[PDB]
Design a protein around this motif. Structure first.
Motif, PDB file in Angstrom:
ATOM      1  N   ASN A   1       5.719  49.577  31.794  1.00  0.00           N
ATOM      2  CA  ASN A   1       5.669  49.641  33.244  1.00  0.00           C
ATOM      3  C   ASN A   1       6.583  50.343  33.783  1.00  0.00           C
TER       4      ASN A   1
ATOM      5  N   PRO B   1       8.616  49.028  36.381  1.00  0.00           N
ATOM      6  CA  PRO B   1       9.783  47.854  36.527  1.00  0.00           C
ATOM      7  C   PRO B   1      10.215  47.441  34.907  1.00  0.00           C
ATOM      8  N   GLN B   2       9.411  47.378  33.963  1.00  0.00           N
ATOM      9  CA  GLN B   2      10.054  46.963  32.892  1.00  0.00           C
ATOM     10  C   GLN B   2      10.723  47.974  32.030  1.00  0.00           C
TER      11      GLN B   2
ATOM     12  N   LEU C   1      14.098  48.011  33.726  1.00  0.00           N
ATOM     13  CA  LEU C   1      14.769  46.896  33.131  1.00  0.00           C
ATOM     14  C   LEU C   1      15.572  47.308  31.870  1.00  0.00           C
TER      15      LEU C   1
END
Ligand SMILES: CCCCC/C=C/C/C=C/C/C=C\C/C=C\CCCC(=O)O[C@H](COC(=O)CCCCCCCCCCCCCCCCC)COP(=O)(O)O[C@@H]1[C@H](O)[C@H](O)[C@@H](OP(=O)(O)O)[C@H](OP(=O)(O)O)[C@H]1O
Ligand SMILES: *[C@@H]1O[C@H](CO)[C@@H](O[C@@H]2O[C@H](CO)[C@@H](O[C@@H]3O[C@H](CO)[C@@H](O[C@@H]4O[C@H](CO)[C@@H](O)[C@H](O)[C@H]4NC(C)=O)[C@H](O)[C@H]3NC(C)=O)[C@H](O)[C@H]2NC(C)=O)[C@H](O)[C@H]1NC(C)=O
Ligand SMILES: CCCCCCCCCCCCCCCCCC(=O)OC[C@H](COP(=O)(O)OCCN)OC(=O)CCCCCCCCCCCCCCCCC
Ligand SMILES: *[C@@H]1O[C@H](CO)[C@@H](O[C@@H]2O[C@H](CO)[C@@H](O[C@@H]3O[C@H](CO)[C@@H](O)[C@H](O)[C@H]3NC(C)=O)[C@H](O)[C@H]2NC(C)=O)[C@H](O)[C@H]1NC(C)=O
Ligand SMILES: *[C@@H]1O[C@H](CO)[C@@H](O[C@@H]2O[C@H](CO)[C@@H](O)[C@H](O)[C@H]2NC(C)=O)[C@H](O)[C@H]1NC(C)=O
Ligand SMILES: CC(C)CCC[C@@H](C)[C@H]1CC[C@H]2[C@@H]3CC=C4C[C@@H](O)CC[C@]4(C)[C@H]3CC[C@]12C
Ligand SMILES: CC(C)CCC[C@@H](C)[C@H]1CC[C@H]2[C@@H]3CC=C4C[C@@H](O)CC[C@]4(C)[C@H]3CC[C@]12C
Ligand SMILES: *[C@@H]1O[C@H](CO)[C@@H](O)[C@H](O)[C@H]1NC(C)=O
Ligand SMILES: *[C@@H]1O[C@H](CO)[C@@H](O)[C@H](O)[C@H]1NC(C)=O
Ligand SMILES: [Ca+2]
Ligand SMILES: [Ca+2]
Lengths: 23, 223, 424, 6, 195, 195, 113
Positions: free
Chosen positions: F152, F154-155, F158
């Protein structure tokens, strides 16, 4: 020749207990 | 994962057409004002052209969906827009020219150590404990480690195991010294000070424990 | 009748474990639980060491004893040992009398030690599933779209292969798959019986499916309902259920569920398999509007416990039937778990009737407490048909209303085969 | 049956 | 040394707490190796000069530790069986399948265990944030904190991914900015000394 | 009272910290109103420390409501009052430099927030490119979920931030290499992205 | 010991690094700056010596299990090995795992009583 008895579709059944009702 | 999709992706695939139309209109209008020598304008042109290429190829074939990685270059146009960020970007990549006599020394050190670890550790990490029954599996636990035959000074297999050749490698064959492609990457990874003890221990379990530390200690002290 | 009256008069002790419930765990040689050590004489009617003083308890390795649910059941299922000890005197030929509880613990009569890894659960046995619900017409829908590739498809291929093991020869099954095109996974193309041979074809074609393409819940669900309306082929004409294996989605398919399931004759059980980040809200809606249930299978250890609880929903109409559902049902010929040869088993489900006269029933009293069975050995049925007077070429034989023989001089105490043997 | 391999 | 081979009897710790005190021998060469005393004095002056940065970094790490205690106290607990979400529900044994093979069962005990570094009290939070600021094992703590949802309950896959903002802010402030302010201070102080 | 909160505290401690967090907020608000009166409104909102203190007190007042009305779980707001412990430096000479450093940091805001914008753009660009390259290709049969993926936004942010910090940056590249084949010639040319 | 002389030919590459200013000026200036301060670099040697001896005395007897972070490769059982462990920790390589593996409640080595 399959079994003669049959037990399904009763109108007093709950229906209120799925697995997602809790959340 | 495997060509699956949902409604949102299908809607974005059609918003992409409007975005490409806007970008193409901009490109044509700007082209007929000047008749493009700037770097940013060249970036815009090569973005819109590859976007048209991708759209046409996707329509034709109904990898094509791999050259869509030119749209991740569009967020670079934000730097072009605001002029208070162009100044900062120039301040960033202007003090990089001084850091070019330290990028060549790094290149020389990596090459030297990759050739040295290739004249020392080439192909010595391709054997592991394999049980003495139905094998082809490595009973060397979830994370197998290289061993040595009972003539060298490497790691010796357990009581009920045998050190047999024919193994892929410590990390599926990526962390090795087999050629000047696998060593150039292992040396870089050890220089970045990440997972260098893993490589040192893998060499320690394959060739012995006396000499190998001089390589990996001097490599990090110098590079 | 003595396992339903006793339970109705049971007070739910939550933390009264200091009362020291006493039993005999079968697999042994604790806070709130004592432990009986028996004498274990050896009997010739059985082939093991059995004591006639109490009933043994089998608790699965995955079920922790000393729990509030388990300790309560070991307390109220203790008046059984008095009626267990009473059925034997009238007929000293009684074999294993067992109460298979819904918690997972069985309490069998012949106090006899249990038989490497003990993967025994009383809720999966054929004599329990037979009496826990009526026959069914389950059709399994497998999501073979792109997003299930990887580990999720590995748990789906095992979950489909583990639910097929919960099917008898009176039930009809077929497995389909949808990847924006609805098709069968095997050569069957309709509802076939769930005997040994047909079940191996279905679970061998499941182990050969590949995940690729977009997902279309509406196209895969029309293929499911339209396969349950055949009526050209032989069917069970009983519980019609659709079991959907998938991860998640964003489509509820409201139009399909009204074009076919308007009268709610088909139950839809939805399984969300794997560890992922997808909207499971639409999946829970299918299992609520249609009279089904929603399950989650996040790992391999949850496959066994989640593919057998769909029988608590199919037993709801059977509980409300009352004494009309108390019919003894004999299972197929099978090899006994406790090494007793070829046996058949009776069956009578028991009901939760707490608060029967005082109207507070139907709260949780729509579920069965457990199924009670009794074993008859084929060497006993071979003793009422003497052969040494007719001739060497004469014999007796008997069959079910299915064709399978229960007694015949060609049936040997060994499992039947389904295909050529393979080993890697 | 004899243990036929795969 | 002296008051040691004289105990010649009292194993009672003592020896074993007087032996780990010989390690001071090297430090008696500071006064007899002029040039080595000068560097010691210079480093003492340097550490006396850089005290404000250390104090205001500890003060900020303390507040971040308190915030972490508020957010994650008693929340990062896990059962060995990833199906039980309560300590009372996490007793006994469970079957785990080796190498993801359904035909290789293995019984293992069930254990209710905390994280390696946990935000339970303020000191444990300080330690966890220190080992996060050293950039070691911080991705493991991040993804263990993302799953935590409730006190005395097990993890839930990707429950609150948005909680990663706390860690991102901590690394931005206490690992990228405050650990560079210290180096800049050292450089500036040395420049002032040289000027 | 803020630093004495642990997991599974006694019943008297959670009442002490519940009555002190109000008895101290009341005193701080009384000091607030006294600051407004004895000095004047403008002479209050001159000093920088006097604007942050108003922020902290209004935040405390507005965060008691959310806790007592059971809407959101405590996150840590009164812990910013411990920044007022920096006033201890006023007795020593390590206050002129600290105030001057903050003054320079506040004078240089169009530079800090502009230098951080290109870092954010770099992370965003290398997140979208990595998400296109390895999106959904980290789906291996093995049981490990591989929490650090590019699935995604957000992932993938990160993962890129973790690579930027450098911790376990080689474990992600070993996964991106096998996602394009293995240790082969064309597949392994994907390590140029991580390098 | 034939390989000790095979590492000589690759060392001829440093002649190319020698030619050309910039590289040869920066390297020489920094080398002569490192040589001009041999006592600032001796503090690190003293620190490593002291901490290696202390760790040797305290955590010396912990049993070496290869399933933990105190194994045959990483241990305090010799001064070279303790110095290598300290070097690894200074590099910042799962040092917290070593700290947790040195926590109280571990098995002592069979040789040590
Ligand atoms: C360490 C072992 C070895 C290195 C090779 C050789 C040792 C033997 C050396 C002969 C060289 C000594 C002569 C020498 O001085 O070398 C330097 C270069 O120094 C390096 O960069 C030295 C570069 C060395 C980098 C080594 C890193 C490679 C990795 C080691 C692999 C070892 C791994 C082994 C693993 C074993 C595992 C079992 C060349 O000359 P120079 O840079 O000093 O400058 C000269 C001269 O010295 C004058 O002093 C200088 O005047 P000023 O600068 O004004 O003061 C003039 O400079 P300019 O003209 O520019 O103004 C020049 O006229
Ligand atoms: C047959 O049906 C009857 C009812 O028709 C059923 O008896 C009922 O059993 C439940 C226990 O499951 C009793 O529940 C009481 O009230 C609550 C509700 O569970 C419990 O408090 C907590 O509940 C949570 C569940 O949300 C549970 O996890 C927790 O452990 C419980 N205890 C805590 C937090 O301390 C009470 O503990 C529980 N017991 C009391 C109050 O004594 C019902 O009261 C029972 N109903 C009747 C009428 O007795 C019976 O179990 C069914 N048969 C079988 C074999 O299950
Ligand atoms: C600036 C600050 C720099 C600090 C120093 C940087 C790091 C230096 C590390 C030096 C020690 C490395 C560890 C080492 O030498 O390995 C131990 C190994 C023992 O091997 P052993 O268990 O005997 O098995 C033999 C198998 N045939 O090795 C041996 O066989 C013994 C080798 C002896 C090495 C002596 C040099 C140490 C110098 C310390 C100062
Ligand atoms: C589940 O809970 C308890 C576990 O032991 C059992 O409750 C106890 O049963 C005993 C056996 O009857 C009682 O002892 C006697 O009870 C009778 C009947 O009232 C009387 O003679 C005396 O009360 C008593 N005799 C004595 C003390 O000499 C216990 O009183 C009784 N305790 C409680 C708290 O109920 C249940 O029987 C058990 N369920 C089953 C099915 O066994
Ligand atoms: C068998 O199933 C079919 C459809 O599944 C039923 O309908 C028949 O369909 C065939 C194929 O188009 C056509 O001959 C007629 O539409 C139907 N046949 C009839 C009405 O005789 C069919 O009724 C089912 N039963 C039989 C005995 O065929
Ligand atoms: C000036 C202020 C910040 C000083 C902070 C110190 C006080 C408030 C804190 C710091 C560490 C804390 C301790 C940390 C851990 C435990 C263990 C357990 O038994 C609960 C209480 C206890 C013992 C805590 C009590 C409060 C404590 C002592
Ligand atoms: C320059 C920075 C920003 C990114 C670098 C990306 C480019 C240079 C690299 C990184 C990953 C690479 C790809 C990795 C793997 C494959 C699969 C195979 O079909 C060969 C080519 C192809 C498709 C490579 C082409 C070049 C590639 C796209
Ligand atoms: C069991 O059946 C036999 C068969 O005739 C007979 O003895 C009787 O019906 C039963 N025995 C009893 C009830 O003891
Ligand atoms: C590591 O040490 C020994 C070595 O076998 C053994 O006790 C076990 O494998 C590990 N220790 C513990 C406490 O598990
Ligand atoms: Ca899908
Ligand atoms: Ca690291």
């Amino acid at each position: 020749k399959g079994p003669d008895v049959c037990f399904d579709n009763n109108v007093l059944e709950d229906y209120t207990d799925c697995g997602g009702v809790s959340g | 994962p495997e060509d699956d999709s949902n409604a949102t992706n299908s809607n974005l695939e059609r918003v992409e057409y409007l975005f490409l139309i806007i970008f193409t209109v901009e490109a044509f209008l700007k082209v007929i004002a000047y008749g493009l020598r700037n770097g940013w304008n060249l970036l815009d042109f090569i973005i819109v052209v590859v976007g048209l290429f991708s759209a046409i190829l996707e329509q034709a074939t109904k990898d094509v969906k791999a050259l869509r990685a030119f749209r991740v270059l569009r967020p670079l146009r934000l730097v072009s827009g605001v002029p208070s960020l162009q100044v900062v970007l120039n301040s960033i990549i202007k003090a990089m020219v001084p850091l070019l006599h330290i990028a060549l020394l790094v290149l020389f050190v990596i090459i030297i150590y990759a050739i040295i670890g290739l004249e020392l550790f080439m192909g010595k990490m391709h054997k592991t404990c394999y049980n003495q029954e139905g094998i082809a599996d490595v009973p060397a636990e979830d994370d197998p480690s290289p061993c040595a035959l009972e003539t060298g000074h490497g790691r010796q297999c357990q009581n009920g195991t045998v050190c047999k050749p024919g193994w892929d490698g410590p990390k599926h064959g990526i962390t090795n010294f087999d050629n000047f492609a696998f060593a150039m990457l292992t040396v870089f990874q050890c220089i970045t000070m990440e997972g260098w003890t893993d490589v040192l221990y893998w060499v320690n379990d394959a060739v012995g424990r006396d000499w190998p530390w001089i390589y990996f200690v001097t490599l990090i002290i110098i590079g | 009748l003595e396992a339903e009256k006793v339970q109705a008069a049971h007070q739910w002790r939550e933390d009264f474990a200091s009362n020291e419930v006493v039993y005999y765990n079968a697999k042994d040689d604790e806070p709130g639980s004592q432990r009986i050590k028996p004498v274990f004489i050896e009997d010739a009617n059985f082939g093991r060491q059995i004591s006639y003083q109490h009933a043994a308890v089998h608790i699965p390795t995955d079920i922790y004893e000393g729990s509030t649910i388990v300790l309560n059941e070991l307390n109220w299922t203790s008046a059984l040992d008095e009626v267990f000890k009473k059925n034997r005197e009238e007929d000293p030929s009684l074999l294993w009398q067992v109460f298979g509880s819904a918690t997972g613990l069985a309490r069998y009569y012949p106090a006899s030690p249990w038989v490497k890894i003990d993967l025994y659960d009383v809720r999966r046995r054929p004599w329990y599933i037979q009496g826990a619900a009526s026959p069914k017409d389950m059709l399994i829908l497998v999501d073979v779209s792109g997003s299930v590739s990887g580990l999720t498809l590995k748990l789906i291929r095992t979950s489909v292969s583990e639910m097929l093991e919960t099917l008898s020869d009176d039930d009809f099954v077929n497995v389909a798959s949808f990847n924006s095109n609805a098709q069968d996974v095997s050569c069957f193309q309709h509802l076939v019986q769930a005997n040994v041979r047909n079940k191996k074809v279905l679970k061998d074609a499941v182990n050969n499916i590949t995940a690729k393409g977009i997902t279309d819940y509406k196209k895969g669900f029309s293929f499911a309902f339209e396969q349950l309306l055949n009526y050209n082929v032989s069917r069970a004409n009983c519980n019609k259920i659709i079991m959907l294996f998938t991860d998640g989605g964003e489509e509820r398919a409201q139009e399909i569920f009204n074009k076919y399931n308007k009268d709610k004759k088909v139950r839809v059980f939805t399984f969300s398999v794997g560890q992922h980040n997808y909207d499971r809200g639409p999946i829970q809606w299918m299992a609520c509007e249609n009279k089904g249930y929603y399950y989650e299978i996040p790992s391999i250890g949850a496959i066994r416990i989640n593919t057998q609880e769909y029988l608590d929903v199919l037993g709801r109409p059977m509980v409300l039937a009352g004494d009309k559902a108390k019919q003894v049902q004999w299972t197929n010929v099978y090899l006994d778990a406790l090494e007793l040869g070829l046996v058949i088993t009776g069956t009578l489900p028991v009901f939760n009737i707490t608060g029967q006269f005082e109207n507070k029933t139907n709260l949780k009293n729509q579920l069965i407490l457990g199924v009670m069975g009794v074993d008859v050995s084929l060497e006993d049925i071979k003793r009422l048909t003497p052969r040494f007077t007719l001739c060497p070429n004469g014999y007796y034989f008997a069959i079910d209303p299915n064709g399978y023989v229960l007694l015949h001089p060609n049936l040997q105490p060994k499992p039947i085969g389904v295909g050529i043997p393979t080993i890697n | 049956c004899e243990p036929g391999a795969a | 040394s002296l008051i040691s081979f004289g105990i010649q009897s009292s194993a009672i710790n003592v020896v074993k707490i007087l032996r780990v005190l010989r390690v001071l021998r090297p430090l008696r060469a500071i006064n007899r190796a002029k040039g080595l005393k000068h560097v010691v004095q210079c480093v003492f002056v340097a550490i006396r000069t850089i005290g404000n940065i250390v104090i205001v970094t500890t003060l900020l790490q303390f507040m971040f530790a308190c915030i972490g205690v508020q957010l994650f106290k008693g929340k990062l607990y896990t059962c060995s069986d990833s199906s039980k979400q309560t300590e009372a529900e996490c007793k006994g044994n469970y079957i785990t399948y080796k190498d993801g093979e359904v035909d290789h069962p293995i019984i293992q005990p069930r254990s209710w265990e905390n994280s390696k570094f946990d935000f339970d009290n303020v000191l444990a939070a300080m330690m966890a944030l220190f080992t996060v600021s050293t950039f070691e094992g911080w991705p493991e703590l991040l993804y263990r904190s993302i799953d935590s949802h409730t006190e005395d309950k097990g993890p839930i896959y990707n429950y609150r991914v948005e909680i990663s903002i706390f860690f991102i802010i901590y690394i931005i402030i206490i690992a990228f900015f405050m650990m560079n302010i210290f180096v800049g201070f050292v450089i500036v102080t040395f420049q002032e000394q040289g000027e | 009272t803020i630093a004495s909160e642990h997991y599974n505290q006694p019943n008297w401690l959670t009442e002490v910290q519940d009555t002190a967090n109000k008895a101290l907020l009341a005193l701080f608000t009384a000091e607030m109103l006294l600051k407004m009166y004895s000095l004047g409104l403008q002479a209050y909102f001159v000093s920088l420390f006097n604007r942050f203190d108003c922020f902290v007190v209004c935040g405390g007042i507005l965060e008691t409501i959310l806790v007592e009305t059971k809407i959101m779980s405590p996150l840590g707001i009164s812990v910013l009052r411990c920044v007022r412990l920096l006033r201890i430096f006023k007795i020593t000479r390590y206050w002129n430099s600290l105030s001057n450093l903050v003054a320079s940091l506040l004078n240089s805001v169009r530079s800090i927030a502009s230098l951080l914008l290109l870092l954010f753009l770099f992370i965003i660009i290398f997140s979208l490119l990595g998400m296109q390259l390895f999106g959904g290709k980290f789906n291996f049969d093995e049981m490990q979920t591989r929490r650090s993926t590019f699935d995604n936004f957000p992932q993938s942010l990160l993962t890129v931030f973790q690579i930027l910090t450098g911790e376990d940056w080689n474990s992600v590249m070993y996964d991106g290499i096998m996602a394009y084949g293995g240790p082969s010639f064309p597949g392994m040319l994907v390590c140029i992205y991580f390098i | 010991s034939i390989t000790f002389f095979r590492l000589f030919r690759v060392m001829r590459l440093v002649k190319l690094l020698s030619r050309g200013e910039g590289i040869r000026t920066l390297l020489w200036t920094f080398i002569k700056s490192f040589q001009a301060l041999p006592y600032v670099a001796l503090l690190i040697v003293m620190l490593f010596f002291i901490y290696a001896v202390i760790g040797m005395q305290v955590f010396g007897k912990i049993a070496l299990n290869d399933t933990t972070e105190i194994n045959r490769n990483n241990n305090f059982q010799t001064f070279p090995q303790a110095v290598l462990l300290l070097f690894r920790c200074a590099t910042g390589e799962a040092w917290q795992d070593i700290m947790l593996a040195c926590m109280p409640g571990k098995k002592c080595a069979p040789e040590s009583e």
